[PDB]
Design a protein around this ligand. Structure first.
Ligand SMILES: Nc1ncnc2c1ncn2[C@@H]1O[C@H](COP(=O)(O)OP(=O)(O)OP(=O)(O)O)[C@@H](O)[C@H]1O
Lengths: 377, 370, 556, 248, 51
């Protein structure tokens, strides 16, 4: 109780301290001019007329306004189908407005480069090769394709078991793309308003068209309504419209033109048939569980950073992993280091990995990995 | 009667929290700012200082900015504050996250350290190496070359106190702890719910070291089954956004995820994979030694007769959970109060176990058969 | 188990009664709630009742023998005579060897080698005489350290490099000296001391003393390396090195005062000033008189420059110092006369409490310190000195009354004498630091903020302290920025990587660079070692004063 | 899931179809037996009593299988008729080969092996019948046995299978005395147990069927008590309850 | 009204012209208020309950 009193006394002391403690030219001349300065609400012109132009503008939700040009403007500068700013009080186009950037679509563009080389991805040479000629070689050297008169697929679908490396390869392509890479946020495409997301998909293609040669990565295609049950309830009707808008813009009545689309799905079966149909996505690069040479290579790349005895045999460790995804092989390397940290040995040994191989695969409830059955030897 | 001092400490703490302008420069800004200021998105930036600002009414008129403290913070997607009438950008953009995200952040953990938990020491070791140890001693992981495991799943039968480990982590964590149930993403509006998952993660990155607890993850992500009837859950889209945040392009920075499920088989394979849950922790029903520590901890702060045999209750009945042990201790105290004895006899504990375990009926004729 | 025994604690009548009936339980009730009563005396129970408990705890423990636990109460009691009686019992049974070896660190400010001769009359094995003197405290340290690791230039590596630009060039060599247990800093480089200049040159010569924490013969080897140094700065550092050679010397200390010591503002006199602090490094407390005669004329001379008086004050605060509650040190008695002599000289006002306050430290009621303070009261710089002395004079125990008194005075808008009061709050509490968080943001005092980082004080290495220093890493005031790394260094005694990288990035100025080096300087609870924090009350000291400030050392 | 074929084994090593059949025995007339020193008894509940039904057939749940053995059947009616015939056949087949009445444990093991086979072979469903065996053999004396659809069997001093078996087993475990059953006392235990297990009030004679096997003059004399004999036992139980009144 | 009195998720009143904090208004609850059913407490039946 005395110890509790000491804390209460400490709180009382803090209360005494708090009570005792209690006991640019922009903000100058410019403000006087700024308050009178008038506003000009943005609006979009749809048409123009002879003699008095009488340009009629839809504000954005208000009305079609027949507004004459403002006195201090050039009639030629105001143009049909051009965003403009109209003062509410003077009801005239005081100043024209530059075209809307639509920043949310601009945000999805990667802009930065992920620092992953193709070297880090391992055990999938064939999958890398297939991606190289739909992503890097057609863009880097189109002449070879033209010589055989063969068009590039212009579309790729990466599908495989989870943790295989589909996205890891995609970030590697982004590192050396030498062309705009547009990662797409799947949730962003779904929107509260009906078909608001569909409008965004048109913008996505429009942005892609403006840039010359760009690759769009629709990771998690299932998020972008990648199914078309389209039942009578039509709960997914808004998303289904968004999916169809992507399909038409992707191909039909003039397709991507210079856009290569990379789509990655853990479950390929769920994807809607129209998207799966080629032309929209000509290549079907499925990633697969790595073979023993691949399993050794993934172990070597993951363990190169870790400090370990030089005599460790990755081939034995890979053999002990019968069907392991790349992520699980990475999990063995990290777990092996954690066991060495637990015993406080700075340099790990082969035994540490074997304990990890049991922990990452056998210890997990795989059941097949842990054997209690004598059955087979 | 030392309670009065404790009550005073609590009241004093509340008072302390309750008790937690320039002569000309501030007054000029006060005049410049409107009595009501409306906050809206910034759509376009123009060098003249008249920048297009989007609003709920959509008036995007270019508006001058005169911010005394700084006007260089303007960015696309920033929520600028505008005068109700003039609509000019008043000053530094408002910087507050969405209200639903604010509720998750937890500053006070009721439970103490791992001391209350008994017999889950192996489970404590795993949570510490993934959560507490990397922050306390970052050098060890770098020297090994290992990158610390960032994700953990606690899976166990009902009442194994998986949540208790999470409460214990909250008690001793440098990282801000965001406690979000998996069932707290029921947003009716199409969209919004996957966006809320993005919001929780962006806040975690803003708070730098952070621990995310998602109790009952079964609701947010299970199976990833097809639409079937065509109702379309949209929950699968929400889970896919979480899957994207944990390991879907970019990076997770320094955010650690703890997730708890009564049933782990139902959870979809992609979510429960290395890279989203590097370490997996299993809580088994307590055995005998684990039961002894739990029984002692629950009875530590109550009157105990010499006659009571803690070992007899633990050995005689096998299957009771750690929560069941606490219930037996609370029930035994009530059984004694019926006889008006504050002290608890061995007889009370024996009666208590029977009352608590009356709903648990298991097994069929699997006795003679094997 | 003593649960209802604690009830009679309020009547001390309890102290005599407790020894009377305590027989069967060697610990149990004697430990637990009665030991918690000792802990509560540290936590909430007042110091006079605490003194009564110490005697009661000694009385019960004496029946159960176990002299080292009884000794811990005796050092807390600060009664040398009571400690000597326990020492006679510990001498009777030979563990006596651990008791002596730990005693050099365990002993309070009451004695340094005074404790070594406390039970010397029997002499016998000569334990405590060598065990409690510097002879056994650091004799096995160099072999023990060798088994764990090999001392070398590893912290002088590029990751640990502190840069040059003159201001940090001296700091980098001194930082390497902190790593020095490790005896090659002077050997490293060619004339590394020559590269050091002015205050830095003093620091490099001081590193000879740092190079050997123990060993008089090894220190004489250091003296030969820089014998009769040509430059005054080298000469002053070499005299200081003689002081840092041992926790106690008995040999080199007598010549160090004899050498130079002009006693008036002069080169030889300034050269001796280093030796004056080094002799101070040897002891701590209030009232010893073994080497008081050697340092008595130095404060008596009262040279107008604070440099002679301030090192003499630092020396006296740690030279002729033994008894608790403060004492009438002959120099401290005339230090007040020197303080009365100087109406101005604000440097005197901060420096004089370095000696007067240190004597008044290691105190209980300190009513005698209050009487000395009544003599001290006068002009405002002296009044600020009185406040600094009063802050040291506070008991340093569970009593919150002294802390509340500083808090109320600190709340006043004028804080010229209240700058160190915030630091005093930390000195008083060493148990549950619930009140340790200080609402510095609420405080508007630039000076209050300046000492706020120092207010956290020395720590084991807890992350909470590092977070506060990081939040205040770049305050507008250069002084505020300077304090956080020194404070980070105090906790240091990431683990250190996050501060080094963050300090470098936030810094980029020479001022910013040096404070950052100081945090890396310390990258790798004793009454005697309560000296360095007191020795650097204000980091406001100028870079030349900061080079003189490098003298601070004592903790393992 | 792991149901349908008796052949499939659940991931927990459980044959659900066999387990379902063992649970099914519950929906059947109560059958109980007491070992009884100097005798043995089988008691059954005659369910589905109606005014029109003749009940001409001697017995209904009690079938003799040999000169010195008998069984009471609880389970699917058709399966019971199949098993009773086979049990009668095995008894005579052993007599033909060895000219000695079959030892009781052996007759039970043989039917149990047939019942066991149905569970191991895919085509057939496990038998839905469980039965109690009363007999005297020279090797082990008076014995009582129980068979399960699983094919497992046991010897019980007292046991019950149909309807509220657990209620009878709990009543039997407390009331039964080892070595002191003394036939007439065992008959009383049966009437009292029957009153508790049956929801029927007053335990009328038509509702109860009692068969007692005794060895008289070196010859087993299996007898099914006539209604008048059953009535006197019921009246004695009612009178005993009247004696219990006031004292209870 | 003090700033301290104001709390998140509180239904305050904003002035018609300047949007000022006129007062703090309670009853900030969704349709679940009807479910409370605290009003019109059910007829007392503890005695009416049987064995
Ligand atoms: N072949 C590989 N080479 C190197 N690292 C790999 C490989 N396969 C998997 N990984 C590791 O697994 C993670 C990469 O997973 P990635 O980003 O490819 O997503 P994914 O799990 O395949 O995608 P999804 O969840 O959609 O199935 C990283 O930790 C990476 O190091």
């Amino acid at each position: 109780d005395d110890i509790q009193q000491l804390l209460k006394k400490i709180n009382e002391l803090t209360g005494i301290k708090e009570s005792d403690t209690g006991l640019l030219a922009a903000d100058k001349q410019t403000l006087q001019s700024e308050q009178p300065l008038q506003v000009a609400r943005c609006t979009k012109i749809i048409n123009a007329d002879s003699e008095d132009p009488k340009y009629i503008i839809n504000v954005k939700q208000f009305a079609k306004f027949v507004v004459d040009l403002s006195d201090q403007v050039a009639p030629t500068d105001i143009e049909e189908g051009m965003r403009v700013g109209v003062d509410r009080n003077k009801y005239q186009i005081h100043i024209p407005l530059p075209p809307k950037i639509d920043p949310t679509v601009t945000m999805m563009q990667v802009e930065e480069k992920p620092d992953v080389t193709y070297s880090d991805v391992g055990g999938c040479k064939e999958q890398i090769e297939k991606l190289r000629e739909v992503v890097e070689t057609p863009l880097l050297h189109p002449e070879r394709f033209v010589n055989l008169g063969i068009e590039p697929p212009k579309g790729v679908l990466l599908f495989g078991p989870p943790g295989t490396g589909k996205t890891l390869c995609a970030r590697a392509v982004a590192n050396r793309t030498d062309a705009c890479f547009i990662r797409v946020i799947g949730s962003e495409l779904v929107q509260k308003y009906v078909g608001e997301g569909a409008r965004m998909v048109r913008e996505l293609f429009e942005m892609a068209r403006t840039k010359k040669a760009c690759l769009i990565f629709f990771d998690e295609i299932d998020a972008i309504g990648g199914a078309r049950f389209d039942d009578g309830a039509g709960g997914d009707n808004e998303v289904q419209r968004t999916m169809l808008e992507l399909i038409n813009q992707l191909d039909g009545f003039d397709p991507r033109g210079n856009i290569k689309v990379l789509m990655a799905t853990n479950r390929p079966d769920t994807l809607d048939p129209a998207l799966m149909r080629p032309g929209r996505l000509d290549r079907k690069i499925e990633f697969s569980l790595p073979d023993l040479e691949g399993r050794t290579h993934i172990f070597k790349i993951h363990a190169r950073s870790m400090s370990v005895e030089r005599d460790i045999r990755f081939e034995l460790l890979a053999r002990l992993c019968p069907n392991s995804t790349g992520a699980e092989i990475r999990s063995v390397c990290t777990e092996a280091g954690m066991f060495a940290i637990r015993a406080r040995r700075k340099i790990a040994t082969e035994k540490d990995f074997l304990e990890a191989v049991n922990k990452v695969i056998k210890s997990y409830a795989k059941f097949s990995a842990t054997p209690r059955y004598m059955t087979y030897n | 009667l030392e309670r009065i001092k404790d009550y005073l400490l609590m009241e004093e703490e509340f008072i302390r929290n309750q008790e937690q302008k320039q002569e000309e420069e501030r007054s000029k800004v006060d005049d410049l700012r409107g009595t009501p200021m409306s906050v809206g998105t910034l759509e376009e930036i123009i060098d003249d200082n008249h920048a297009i600002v989007s609003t709920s009414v959509g008036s995007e008129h270019y508006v001058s900015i005169l911010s005394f403290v700084d006007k260089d913070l303007l960015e696309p997607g920033c929520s600028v504050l505008l005068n109700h009438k003039v609509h000019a950008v008043i000053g530094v953009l408002m910087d507050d996250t969405d209200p639903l995200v604010t509720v998750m952040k937890v500053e006070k953990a009721p439970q103490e350290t791992y001391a209350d938990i008994g017999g889950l020491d192996n489970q404590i070791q795993e949570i510490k190496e993934s959560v507490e140890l990397p922050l306390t001693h970052p050098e060890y992981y770098e020297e090994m070359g290992i990158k610390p495991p960032k994700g953990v799943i606690l899976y166990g039968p009902p009442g194994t106190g998986k949540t208790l480990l999470a409460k214990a982590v909250a008690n001793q964590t440098s990282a801000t702890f965001l406690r979000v149930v998996g069932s707290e993403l029921i947003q009716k509006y199409l969209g919004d719910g996957p966006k809320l998952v993005r919001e929780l993660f962006r806040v975690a990155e803003e708070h730098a070291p952070s621990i995310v607890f998602i109790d009952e993850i079964d609701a947010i992500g299970t199976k990833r089954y097809d639409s079937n009837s065509g109702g379309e859950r949209e929950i699968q889209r929400t889970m896919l956004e979480l899957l994207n945040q944990l390991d879907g392009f970019d990076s997770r920075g320094d955010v650690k995820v703890i997730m708890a499920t009564n049933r782990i088989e139902t959870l979809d394979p992609a979510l429960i994979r290395p890279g989203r849950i590097d370490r997996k922790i299993e809580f088994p029903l307590p055995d005998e030694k684990t039961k002894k520590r739990i029984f002692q901890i629950h009875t530590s702060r109550m009157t105990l007769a010499d006659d009571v045999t803690l070992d007899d209750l633990i050995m005689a009945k096998d299957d009771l959970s750690g929560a069941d042990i606490k219930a037996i201790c609370t029930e035994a105290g009530l059984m004694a109060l019926r006889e008006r004895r504050m002290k608890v006899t061995n007889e009370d504990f024996k009666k208590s176990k029977e009352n608590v375990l009356y709903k648990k009926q298991e097994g069929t004729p699997e006795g003679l058969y094997l | 188990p003593l649960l209802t025994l604690v009830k009679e604690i309020v009547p001390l009548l309890m102290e005599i009664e407790q020894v009377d009936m305590l027989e069967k339980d060697i610990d149990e009730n004697a430990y637990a709630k009665v030991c918690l009563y000792l802990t509560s005396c540290v936590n909430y129970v007042p110091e006079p009742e605490n003194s009564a408990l110490l005697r009661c705890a000694l009385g019960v423990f004496r029946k159960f023998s176990r002299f080292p636990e009884a000794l811990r109460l005796a050092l807390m009691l600060n009664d040398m005579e009571l400690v000597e009686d326990i020492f006679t019992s510990c001498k009777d049974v030979v563990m006596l060897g651990r008791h002596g070896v730990f005693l050099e660190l365990s002993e309070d400010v009451e004695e340094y080698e005074d404790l070594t001769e406390i039970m010397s009359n029997v002499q016998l094995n000569s334990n405590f005489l060598a065990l409690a003197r510097e002879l056994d405290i650091m004799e096995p340290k160099v072999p023990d350290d060798i088994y764990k690791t090999h001392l070398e230039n590893n912290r002088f590596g590029g990751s640990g490099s502190q840069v040059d630009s003159a201001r940090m060039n001296l700091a980098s060599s001194f930082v390497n000296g902190f790593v020095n247990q490790d005896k090659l800093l002077t050997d490293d480089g060619n004339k590394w001391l020559y590269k050091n200049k002015d205050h830095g040159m003093l620091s490099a010569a001081a590193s000879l003393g740092m190079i050997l924490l123990w060993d008089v013969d090894g220190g004489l080897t250091q003296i030969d390396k820089y014998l009769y140094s040509s430059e005054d700065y080298i000469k002053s550092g070499a005299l200081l090195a003689c002081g840092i050679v041992n926790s106690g010397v008995r040999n080199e200390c007598d010549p160090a005062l004899a050498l130079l010591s002009d006693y008036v503002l002069h080169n030889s006199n300034t050269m001796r000033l280093g030796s004056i602090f080094g002799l101070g490094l040897a002891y701590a407390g209030s009232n010893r008189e073994d080497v008081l005669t050697l340092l008595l004329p130095v404060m008596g001379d009262s040279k107008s420059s604070m440099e002679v008086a301030g090192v003499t004050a630092l020396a006296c605060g740690m030279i002729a110092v033994g008894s608790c509650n403060g004492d009438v040190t002959s120099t401290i008695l005339q230090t007040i006369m020197e303080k009365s002599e100087t109406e101005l000289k604000d440097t005197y006002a901060r420096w004089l409490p370095l000696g007067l306050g240190l004597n008044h430290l290691g105190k209980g009621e300190a009513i005698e310190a209050i009487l000395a303070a009544l003599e001290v009261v006068s002009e405002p710089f002296r009044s600020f000195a009185n406040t600094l002395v009063d802050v040291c004079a506070y008991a340093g125990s569970g009593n919150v009354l002294k802390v509340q008194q500083l808090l109320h005075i600190c709340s006043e808008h004028f804080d010229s004498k209240e700058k160190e009061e915030d630091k005093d709050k930390k000195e008083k509490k060493d148990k549950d630091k619930k009140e340790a968080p200080a609402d510095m943001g609420a405080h508007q005092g630039v000076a209050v903020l300046g000492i706020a980082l120092i207010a956290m004080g020395e720590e084991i290495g807890a992350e909470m302290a590092l977070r506060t220093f990081g939040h205040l890493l770049r305050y507008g005031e250069p002084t505020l920025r300077r304090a956080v790394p020194l404070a980070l260094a105090l906790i240091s005694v990431s683990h250190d990587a996050d501060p080094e990288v963050s300090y470098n990035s936030i810094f980029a100025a020479r001022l910013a660079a040096m404070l950052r080096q100081l945090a890396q300087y310390h990258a790798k609870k004793g009454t005697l070692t309560l000296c360095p924090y007191h020795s650097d009350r204000q980091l406001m000291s100028q870079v030349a004063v900061a080079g003189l400030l490098t003298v601070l050392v004592s903790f393992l | 899931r792991y149901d349908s074929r008796t052949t499939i084994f659940s991931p927990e090593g459980r044959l659900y179809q066999v387990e379902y059949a063992m649970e099914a025995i519950g929906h059947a007339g109560t059958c109980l037996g007491i070992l009884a020193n100097d005798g043995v008894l089988l008691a059954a509940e005659r369910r589905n009593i109606h005014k029109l039904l003749d009940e001409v057939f001697f017995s209904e749940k009690i079938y003799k299988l040999n000169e010195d053995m008998a069984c009471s059947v609880a389970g699917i009616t058709s399966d019971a008729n199949v098993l009773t015939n086979e049990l009668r056949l095995i008894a005579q087949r052993y007599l033909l080969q060895y000219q000695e009445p079959i030892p009781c444990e052996q007759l039970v093991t043989a039917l149990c092996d047939i019942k066991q086979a149905y569970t191991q072979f895919g085509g057939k469903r496990p038998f839905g019948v469980s039965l109690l065996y009363i007999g005297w053999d020279k090797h082990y004396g008076f014995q009582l046995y129980q068979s399960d659809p699983s094919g497992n069997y046991g010897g019980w001093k007292a046991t019950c299978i149909g309807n509220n078996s657990a209620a009878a087993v709990s009543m039997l475990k407390q009331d039964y005395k080892e070595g002191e059953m003394t036939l007439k006392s065992a008959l009383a235990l049966a009437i009292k147990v029957l009153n508790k297990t049956m929801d029927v009030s007053k335990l009328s004679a038509e509702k109860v069927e009692i068969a007692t096997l005794t060895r008289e003059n070196g010859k087993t004399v299996i007898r099914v008590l006539k209604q008048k004999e059953v009535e006197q036992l019921i009246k004695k139980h009612e009178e005993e309850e009247a004696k219990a009144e006031r004292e209870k | 009204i003090d700033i301290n009195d104001v709390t998140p998720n509180c239904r305050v009143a904003l002035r018609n012209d300047s949007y000022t904090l006129h007062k703090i208004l309670p009853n900030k609850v969704d349709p679940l208020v009807s479910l409370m059913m605290v009003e019109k407490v059910p007829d007392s039946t503890y005695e009416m309950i049987g064995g």
